[PDB]
């Protein structure tokens, strides 16, 4: 009751926040729901993911704009430390959110039990937010962060290739994000191209067997895989 009703309330308020595009509030509500101890359903997992995706999404975009300006500061002007100071402020906010997500994954969500979908979902999410931290890391902390992201993706990879078909949307999304990691973070464009191509090829061979449930979902991810390949290969 005190927990069951509070959880239900937080979930309903998370859905209200989503409709209102109040993604910071949404993230807060879902974090509160997670801490009630009960596991998240597929719907609730997506609420958590959509909430924090938009939060860090805005921060990452803001960080990218400020970094580009900072890199072109001494070229032409701005001249002063304003860009760096504000970029570091945004960077610090971003790292706080990522640290909140990762802390929630290790504390409540990542378990040895549970179906393959949920386990791959949270391990992918762990890799995603270590990857976001790597986007802004500069030095030795970067290497540890990169390794943490690779280990989370690889563990998710091993589970997906063992317990889910090649057309499964969660597997496809994992492979997509892991290839982006290889290309952008690890600077290994050969592994990224190879992983994306293998993912697309093996999914294509089973598309005729794909259910209408995942038809659209898997199809969209496959379009992304092929769009990235067209870009990575041509240059």
């Amino acid at each position: 009751g005190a927990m069951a009703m509070e959880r239900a309330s937080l979930i309903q308020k998370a859905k209200l926040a989503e409709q209102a595009e109040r993604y910071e509030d949404m993230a807060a509500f879902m974090k509160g729901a997670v801490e009630k101890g009960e596991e998240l359903s597929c719907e609730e997992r997506n609420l958590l993911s959509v909430a924090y995706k938009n939060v860090v999404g805005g921060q990452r975009a803001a960080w990218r704009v400020l970094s580009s300006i900072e890199q072109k500061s001494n070229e032409e002007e701005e001249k002063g430390p304003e860009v760096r100071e504000y970029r570091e402020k945004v960077e610090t906010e971003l790292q706080g959110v990522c640290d909140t997500v990762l802390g929630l994954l290790d504390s409540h969500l990542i378990k040895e039990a549970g179906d393959a979908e949920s386990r791959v979902f949270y391990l992918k999410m762990k890799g995603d937010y270590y990857r976001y931290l790597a986007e802004v890391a500069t030095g030795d902390d970067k290497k540890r962060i990169i390794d943490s992201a690779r280990s989370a993706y690889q563990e998710a990879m091993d589970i997906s290739k063992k317990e889910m078909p090649p057309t499964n949307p969660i597997r496809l999304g994992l492979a997509l994000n892991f290839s982006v990691f290889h290309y952008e973070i690890a600077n290994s464009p050969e592994e990224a191209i190879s992983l994306a191509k293998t993912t697309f090829d093996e999914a294509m061979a089973d598309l005729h067997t794909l259910s209408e449930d995942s038809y659209k979902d898997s199809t969209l991810i496959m379009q992304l895989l092929r769009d990235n390949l067209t870009l990575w290969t041509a240059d």
Partner: peptide
């Protein structure tokens, strides 16, 4: 954002 390759979250 200036990035052209995409992650799954863009959906």
């Amino acid at each position: 954002n200036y990035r052209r390759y995409k992650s799954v979250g863009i959906l």
